[PDB]
Design a protein around this ligand. Structure first.
Ligand SMILES: CCCCCC/C=C/C=C/C/C=C/C/C=C/CCCC(=O)O[C@H](COC(=O)CCCCCCCCCCCCCCCCC)COP(=O)(O)O[C@@H]1[C@H](O)[C@H](OP(=O)(O)O)[C@@H](O)[C@H](OP(=O)(O)O)[C@H]1O
Ligand SMILES: CCCCCC/C=C/C=C/C/C=C/C/C=C/CCCC(=O)O[C@H](COC(=O)CCCCCCCCCCCCCCCCC)COP(=O)(O)O[C@@H]1[C@H](O)[C@H](OP(=O)(O)O)[C@@H](O)[C@H](OP(=O)(O)O)[C@H]1O
Ligand SMILES: CC(C)CCC[C@@H](C)[C@H]1CC[C@H]2[C@@H]3CC=C4C[C@@H](O)CC[C@]4(C)[C@H]3CC[C@]12C
Ligand SMILES: CC(C)CCC[C@@H](C)[C@H]1CC[C@H]2[C@@H]3CC=C4C[C@@H](O)CC[C@]4(C)[C@H]3CC[C@]12C
Ligand SMILES: CC(C)CCC[C@@H](C)[C@H]1CC[C@H]2[C@@H]3CC=C4C[C@@H](O)CC[C@]4(C)[C@H]3CC[C@]12C
Ligand SMILES: CC(C)CCC[C@@H](C)[C@H]1CC[C@H]2[C@@H]3CC=C4C[C@@H](O)CC[C@]4(C)[C@H]3CC[C@]12C
Ligand SMILES: [Cl-]
Ligand SMILES: [Cl-]
Ligand SMILES: [Cl-]
Ligand SMILES: [Cl-]
Lengths: 706, 120, 704, 32
């Protein structure tokens, strides 16, 4: 065919049927040429192994980048508190690694590490030392945020945000050129570390999915099969997203479950094993570099009891409520950023938010602590060896009020910040903030339950389930359940979320409470709204995304959504023969239609096929260059084989999809979703009457929802 | 590498003596309660009780991995910032690709910064 | 509409589109009636909770039945060895559980338990005692097998077999009335316990899925939404299959992965959470009943090393090989059963197979021991506390040859027996036999590798990976990997299998070796054939199952598969008006077409709709009963509103799927697979020209 | 150990098996 045929413009959905057919034709050619020569056999073998090789490369790159990002983010976050003069490449934990001056009270206390007050003021303690530490913390946070936003602006503006919404849209068939490019990969990798160091209420776990998808796209470019075909590249991107989730949470099974559940609009069977393999490879790499097995390992000696389900369900409810609230708040805030002028100053916005978050973060310990470190600490179970402040009250009696007040202040702070932080134009994620909020809430709830059990053991439930004077209640389990509930409420993810949380925990005993809390949070959120944060952001950005949840009214008919309608003039049509090249070029220029139907005759209106505008113009230009005398006067014949007429039957889909006008539009939406149809030609009495496009379907869905 | 490996024993408070942590660079077989702490506060008969309450681990790390990751990340960030300064000040087939990317990043920056509403 | 309209005959596929439309119409009706009264609101709330309630009931029933079956099977299997006089209701382990006469050499040696020789011969040891134990073991195996096959034949013929292939066909739209009925459920449970007791090379884990599916169907009958609509019932059946796998292996996540990967033809997103929840519920019930949280818990102190991947890969290959062989052997044997006269005597075949199995199993310890128990023993790591014969050689030097010879004999016996034991007319599962074969092979390979490491530690790989004089090798890990490889090769399950093994053994650290072995086994099996055992059995049985792998020839076009073709007469069409009831009934009787097209005129051949033959006859009879004077002379008008003509437009499909003749057949198979259509009407120039059906596509694919 | 669980499972399984065999015998002989 003509070079460039079968390609799509930027921001254009792909026709899955046509892409599949192109893949089948390429397979025909490659398989046929195998017997021609041994080199053809080697090429065919490489094509057969192209999928395995691409998933392996994607997993390796995802693991390497995830490990680098994690280590760099940890070091940069620890830079704010102070510096290690002996080893500038060591964070606070690594600087105090070999120190023998450590004490039981302070594990990270060593003369090697020097706080900024010690560097400048020279005093580790004192009002001036605290003032200087505060000022330097704010300064470092602002510097990191400004660097991240500037790098996003100058090089990769698409690098901002989690990217899960745009990945979901892309896997549905949408095309966003440059989203998965080299520049976006590099800039996002750097700015993720920068933003995480800045201390903003965001996480790097979610954006790792987009990073992995970028790696997968770059690797798909190497293999011809996955480069020519958009659907094949999207399968590779689903595998890449699974690998990204795996590296983010160390959960390969959870990664595959998330990829199937959320991002992958179409999930063939072979994608399942490919995604699992890629996730395993990436996790193995991360374990090879990042350690220096379970990131959030928990040791709750007492098993979860049935009555504990009641508090857990409450956490679930909370996980839903906040979730819904956030989906109502952030979107609105984001919407304002699109309508008001405060979105016209993105660097100023990020700098301001970093200033406020650092200012409100330094005073409190939990808020100042890194979000991932805070989640880990909240997950840890209290023990005699532990010196955590959270358990101080348990040591005192067995200040609880002081710890609960600090946790509540941290919860309020994080909840307020996360709304503004998401939508800010640096690589940000919702997994870590939501997990931190839910963990704080669960720790508060678990502390309350433990206090109730210890103070009141006469209650029959407490006495029967827990021995008198026994610490059956484990705050870490409650924190885990709260984190799972909040994440399920905000994301509306049920199975992938539960499996990811279990893998990150490393314990299968807590599957039932986690599922119960996630189900309760999802149900509460659905009561307050059936759209998740990712779906809500997709709708806010107005991307062409079609979902199974959306449906049309029974009164809607294919005639109603037909493009020509009444006010619109008759849809552009192309006569099979007796038409000049100039006519086709003028029609292409005049109309923005993705494609034009080709009919046997203008009066007959008997459809022959569908000619895409891109394919038509590409073929016309290539024929003009190839063959002389094509000044536009020569006619074009779409029928099967001096004027030297141009032939455009090759670029014509000889088998266009067709539905009848009295067909309910519900069936049309089902066909579009199942077959991934770009357009469908509504014909009456065997003659063309109109066209329904996926864009038309989305527009009428938006009108109904609006 | 001594700094890469150590063995640490953390003991919670026992009777009169409060909790204490003792660290030393020794091998796994040498890594144990009686070797890491020398001498100990508790008496001889209670020494076993204190060790049982105490918990010991042998820890190892790969300082080279952290060093290389930090160094390469810093080098990439510095090169990116130098290129940013080049674009901000100096700029006013590889070259063809770079100019094409300049146009593409201008387009993406207009979509993502100026409007925030990219529909097509 | 007319009562009975939209129903499907036995052994007939459903059209997912009509079922979805019916479900949405019912949803609209319920939502509209909600405001009418408070009781309507309560009914709608119950309808909303119908899915959760039905999956909960399915999970509870699956867990209870799985626990019951497991305990009864254990007790019955221990029945063959002997009886516990002090407790006629404990098995061998339970009888000696509290005995103080237990010895280190024999853990299950107690006086309360008495072997049949003690009951009859009176001497625990001696040639006569051994002979009497032998004959009593054979007799008990024969009795159990005969009773199982008799119960299968007399009451529930569908109880025979694992049922996973039939569940695949059902979840693809096929209908087998009675497969998921109460009779099938009960007979399947009883005969599963009996067959496992008999000692045949079969397992209850796979058939537990079908038990769960039967429970799910029975519960679906309770809730109107899922009973009325076939697709909704199939979603419940997918959840039931997930719960069944969960109870079978205590692997909820693995159960959902199996449901998505293998049995569920269409898997909606909501069904994902429903299946996982049902699996967790069923696992909770099983944990509450069967124990008295990992069935095959393993403790491998030494982590797997990179070099060990090479033996694991080898195991993979072996699995694949065996896999292929079985899919080439069993099917053939099964085909012989369908072609020859030994299939006319299923009871005799079952009895003979049980006799041979018991006779060859008693002499050897591994084969005599229950297959699940043998797998568990193989998975356990050798240690000083362990007194297993497999590790005796390790206790000696550190008879290996004798233990390896016994393991090889057990492997050969199991491989031969599984070929003749799968497909017989009793509930049989391939999971346990495949796992046992792979575990024996992996244990042999691991013992060999341990011997190589110990004898030759000078090798740089062994010295670097393993300290000199250290038991780095773990035979239990190799057995686990071999079992996973064999199961993957025979079933061609990749992710669900790996997660199921991980949850069955609780070992996440060994995920990578299992993945590698399963991938290798699947790839060799594909080299020998892309179809697994279940797909091969579906093809052998002749069920109408369509898979994504199947595709048509590239010169094929819609016209080629069109029903009328050339030799066949023009496909029957119904005139919209001026057509009699008698003539429609005569057309229904004349042809066995699933449905006839309805055209506005014979000459024009303009398709108006598609009226199902079953729906047409039901409507005609119902109208005859309802309205007098319909003796067949009255005309039938399919057009929109003395003769009092019958109106069949309601039962007519106003918008049937249509595809142009020039359309390649492969586009048509993609359409059919995606939308699950029963038939599509090929029309040329806007006029009906032919009809393609799911059966036409399946027949043409089979011919190719 | 949960002796009562094995108790009930074994007893009810035996009862159901006996009932099924009795029904089979009746169908074989009594039903004719
Ligand atoms: C250690 C710390 C961790 C760091 C992370 C490491 C991994 C990152 C991967 C490396 C990528 C490198 C980024 C090269 C830019 C690129 O290569 O950028 C293409 C534009 O020229 C150019 O080289 C411009 C290069 C100007 C000078 C480079 C200075 C160097 C900077 C200092 C650090 C270097 C060290 C890195 C070592 C590793 C345009 O390529 P792109 O960036 O890919 O963007 C579009 C997209 O790919 C579409 O893909 P899609 O439709 O599938 O989405 C295509 O279709 C479009 O193609 P078109 O050109 O025909 O329009 C294409 O432009
Ligand atoms: C403890 C040990 C563990 C054991 C396991 C316990 C769980 C098992 C559940 C209990 C079910 C019980 C089995 C009832 C037969 C049934 O109930 O059988 C229906 C036919 O009359 C009859 O009762 C005949 C009864 C003659 C005497 C019964 C003697 C009693 C025997 C002694 C032990 C019983 C104790 C059980 C307690 C639990 C026909 O019903 P079916 O068995 O359901 O078969 C077809 C299918 O359901 C299709 O469903 P599908 O389209 O979804 O595939 C329908 O559509 C068809 O309907 P149609 O009748 O209009 O043709 C339908 O026949
Ligand atoms: C083209 C892309 C996919 C290539 C990416 C290759 C990456 C994954 C490679 C390059 C260098 C590699 C590392 C090199 C050295 C070691 C030390 C060894 O004791 C553990 C593995 C480890 C830490 C490797 C892990 C994988 C690694 C990071
Ligand atoms: C945006 C990110 C990547 C930049 C990171 C650069 C950091 C690590 C740099 C910037 C300024 C540096 C400090 C500047 C001055 C001194 C005084 C000297 O006697 C010891 C080192 C010390 C204390 C430096 C440590 C490293 C330092 C904090
Ligand atoms: C209609 C169907 C779904 C109902 C099935 C109900 C089943 C699942 C019920 C009936 C009796 C129940 C058992 C009754 C008693 C006990 C003892 C308790 O210490 C643990 C739970 C356990 C073991 C229950 C498990 C669930 C159980 C087996
Ligand atoms: C097909 C299955 C369900 C039938 C199971 C029936 C079993 C349990 C029955 C059948 C024959 C029975 C035995 C027959 C005779 C005796 C002698 C008596 O002094 C002690 C009990 C003992 C040893 C019985 C134990 C139970 C027994 C083994
Ligand atoms: Cl995140
Ligand atoms: Cl995110
Ligand atoms: Cl089985
Ligand atoms: Cl099976």
């Amino acid at each position: 065919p003509i070079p460039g045929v079968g390609t799509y413009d930027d921001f254009h959905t792909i026709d899955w049927v046509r892409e599949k057919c192109k893949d089948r034709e390429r397979h025909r050619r490659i398989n046929s040429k195998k017997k021609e020569s041994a080199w053809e056999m080697t090429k065919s073998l490489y094509d057969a192994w192209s999928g395995w090789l691409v998933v392996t490369l994607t997993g390796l790159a995802s693991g390497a980048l995830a490990g680098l990002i994690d280590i760099a983010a940890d070091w940069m976050t620890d830079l704010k508190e102070g510096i290690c003069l002996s080893a500038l490449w060591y964070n606070h934990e690594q600087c105090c690694w070999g120190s023998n001056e450590t004490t039981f009270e302070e594990r990270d206390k060593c003369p090697q590490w020097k706080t900024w007050a010690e560097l400048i003021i020279g005093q580790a303690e004192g009002p001036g030392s605290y003032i200087m530490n505060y000022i330097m913390y704010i300064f470092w946070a602002l510097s990191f945020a400004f660097l991240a936003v500037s790098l996003v602006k100058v090089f990769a503006p698409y690098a901002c945000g989690s990217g899960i919404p745009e990945i979901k849209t892309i896997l549905s068939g949408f095309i966003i050129r440059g989203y998965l490019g080299k520049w976006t990969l590099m800039i996002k990798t750097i700015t993720l570390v920068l933003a995480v160091a800045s201390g903003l209420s965001l996480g790097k776990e979610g954006p790792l999915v987009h990073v992995a998808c970028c790696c997968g796209n770059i690797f798909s470019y190497l293999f011809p099969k996955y480069s020519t075909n958009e659907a094949k590249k999207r399968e590779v991107l689903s595998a890449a997203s699974a690998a990204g989730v795996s590296v983010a949470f160390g959960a390969p099974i959870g990664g595959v479950l998330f990829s199937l559940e959320e991002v992958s609009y179409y999930f063939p069977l072979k994608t399942l094993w490919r995604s699992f393999f890629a996730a395993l490879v990436a996790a193995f790499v991360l374990r090879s570099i990042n350690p220096f097995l379970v990131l959030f390992y928990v040791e709750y000696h007492t098993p979860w009891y049935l009555f504990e389900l009641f508090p857990f369900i409450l956490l679930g409810v909370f996980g839903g409520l906040w979730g819904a609230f956030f989906i109502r708040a952030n979107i609105a805030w984001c919407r304002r950023r699109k309508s008001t002028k405060f979105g016209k100053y993105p660097v100023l916005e990020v700098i301001i938010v970093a200033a406020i978050t650092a200012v409100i973060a330094f005073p409190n310990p939990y808020t100042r602590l890194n979000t991932s470190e805070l989640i880990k600490e909240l997950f840890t179970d209290c023990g005699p060896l532990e010196s955590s402040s959270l358990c101080d009250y348990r040591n005192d009696m067995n200040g609880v009020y002081s710890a609960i007040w600090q946790l509540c202040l941290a919860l309020i702070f994080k909840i307020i910040m996360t709304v503004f932080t998401f939508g800010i134009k640096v690589p940000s994620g919702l997994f870590i903030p939501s997990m931190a909020i839910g963990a704080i809430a669960g720790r508060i709830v678990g502390i309350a339950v433990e206090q109730l059990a210890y103070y009141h053991h006469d209650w029959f439930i407490f006495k029967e389930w827990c021995e008198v004077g026994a610490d059956c209640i484990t705050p870490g389990l409650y924190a885990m359940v709260g984190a799972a509930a909040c994440l399920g409420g905000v994301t509306r993810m049920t199975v992938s979320l539960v499996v990811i949380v279990f893998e990150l925990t490393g314990g299968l005993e807590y599957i039932v409470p986690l599922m119960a809390a996630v189900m309760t949070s999802k149900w509460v959120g659905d009561a307050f709204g059936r759209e998740g944060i990712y779906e809500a952001h997709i709708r806010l950005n107005g991307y062409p995304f079609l979902d199974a949840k959306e449906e049309f009214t029974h009164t809607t008919l294919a005639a109603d959504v037909m493009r020509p309608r009444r006010n619109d003039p008759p849809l552009a049509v192309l006569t099979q023969d007796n038409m000049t090249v100039d006519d086709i070029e003028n029609m292409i220029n005049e109309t923005s239609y993705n494609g034009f139907p080709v009919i046997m005759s203008k009066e007959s209106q008997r459809l022959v096929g569908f000619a895409l505008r891109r394919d038509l113009t590409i073929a016309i230009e290539s024929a003009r260059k190839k063959q002389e005398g094509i000044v536009g006067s020569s006619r074009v014949c779409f029928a099967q084989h001096s004027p030297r007429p141009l032939k455009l039957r090759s670029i014509l889909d000889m088998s266009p999809f067709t539905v009848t006008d009295h067909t309910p539009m519900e069936i049309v939406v089902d066909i579009f979703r199942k077959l991934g149809l770009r357009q469908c030609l509504v014909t009456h009495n065997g003659r063309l009457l109109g066209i329904i496009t996926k864009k038309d379907i989305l527009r009428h869905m938006a009108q109904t929802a609006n | 590498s001594s700094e890469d490996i150590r063995c640490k024993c953390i003991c919670p408070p026992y009777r009169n003596i409060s909790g204490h942590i003792y660290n030393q660079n020794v091998s796994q077989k040498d890594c144990n309660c009686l070797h890491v702490v020398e001498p100990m506060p508790v008496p001889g008969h209670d020494v076993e009780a204190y060790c049982l309450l105490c918990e010991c681990r042998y820890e190892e790390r790969s300082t080279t991995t952290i060093k290389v990751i930090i160094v390469i990340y810093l080098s990439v960030v510095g090169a990116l910032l130098l290129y940013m300064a080049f674009l901000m000040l100096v700029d006013p087939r590889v070259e063809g690709a770079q100019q094409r990317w300049k146009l593409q990043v201008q387009e993406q920056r207009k979509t993502v910064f100026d409007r925030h509403k990219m529909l097509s």
